[PDB]
Amino acid sequence: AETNEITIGITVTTTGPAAALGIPERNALEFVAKEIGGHPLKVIVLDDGGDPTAATTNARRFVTESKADVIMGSSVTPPTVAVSNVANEAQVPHIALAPLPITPERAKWSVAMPQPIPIMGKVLYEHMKKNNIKTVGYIGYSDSYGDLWFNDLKKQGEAMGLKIVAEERFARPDTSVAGQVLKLVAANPDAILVGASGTAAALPQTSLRERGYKGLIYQTHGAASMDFIRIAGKSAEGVLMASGPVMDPEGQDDSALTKKPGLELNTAYEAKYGPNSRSQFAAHSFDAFKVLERVVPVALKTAKPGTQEFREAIRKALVSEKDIAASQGVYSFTETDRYGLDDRSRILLTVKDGKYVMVK
Ligand SMILES: O=C(O)/C=C/c1ccc(O)c(O)c1
Incomplete structure (x- = not known):
């Protein structure tokens, strides 16, 4: 099993009360890269309704059915913790779209896009x-x-x-x-x-x-x-x-590294959904793709998509690639700092x- 496409599984909350967070996250996917290094991105988006059991099932489906290279989600913290459990057991890189408590059991395969609480x-x-x-x-x-x-x-x-x-x-x-x-x-x-x-x-x-x-x-x-x-x-x-x-x-x-990416996202989002429809939440999924734009070409140098070697190369690239500019911040992950922000x-x-x- 080795593929031309890069497969990205996303679980977010698009039904129930937390749809206020997941719907803009889903909508921002219209404006992210469709190919990286000429490899098309196959993006599978599943609703979890905010439920950690559903998130667990979705995340495992991405591993076993879809053979995902990267999994992302969820919209709120309890299902995000669930996704991180699956990702760490399956050894698949996971970009969290809600803050979550990093413990040693979750740190190897999980990074987070939202600003850390402290x-x-x-x-x-x-x-x-x-x-x-x-x-x-x-x-x-x-x-x-x-x-x-x-x-x-x-x-x-x-x-x-x-x-x-x-x-x-x-x-x-x-x-x-x-x-x-x-x-x-x-x-x-x-x-x-x-x-x-x-x-x-x-x-x-x-x-x-x-x-x-x-x-x-x-x-x-x-x-x-x-x-x-x-x-x-x-x-x-x-x-x-x-x-x-x-x-x-x-x-x-103009000297802020965050400015051009913020303008790119907001211009796209607000052209479709109107003035002042920008949100914190749209930006997280958009920014996850900015991270992938930096780390996937590094992994492509040494490993084929759809392989454990590719998953491992992405994991290593998350820490080796510094100062990833995005709309919400400039990310420098390390083995211990899984948020990478200042x-x-x-x-x-x-x-x-x-x-x-x-x-x-
Ligand atoms: O409800 C929660 O569990 C927290 C949600 C949350 C908090 C901060 C963010 O930037 C974000 O996308 C989501």
């Missing part, structure tokens, strides 16, 4: 300090994503002089967070960090304001699309939100009169 937390906690915030409450998912954030707030947050005074959790599918909001408003912190994503991110935003909270609200990069503003409406005003720089390529210097990979956003504005 890089995003740093920009949020610094703004807190600069705005005279001393006490902070947290509301987030009762799963690995909500844990990543809470654990960072506690470690980074306390170390630069923030006090956590309240912690509440909710489940992704929950339609109400009334109970949690009552306890947060009762604690009355200066600021609240919401550890959520997509549509669910807007539920604490609206409930907190409707319940009369008047402190600062901070949101994570999981919330970084126009849909958050659509859902939260006036309650989104003054929110502070971590995002990738693809949200504002126009505001970047300060060029984030900006801080606020919302003013219903639009995103960069906090300068």
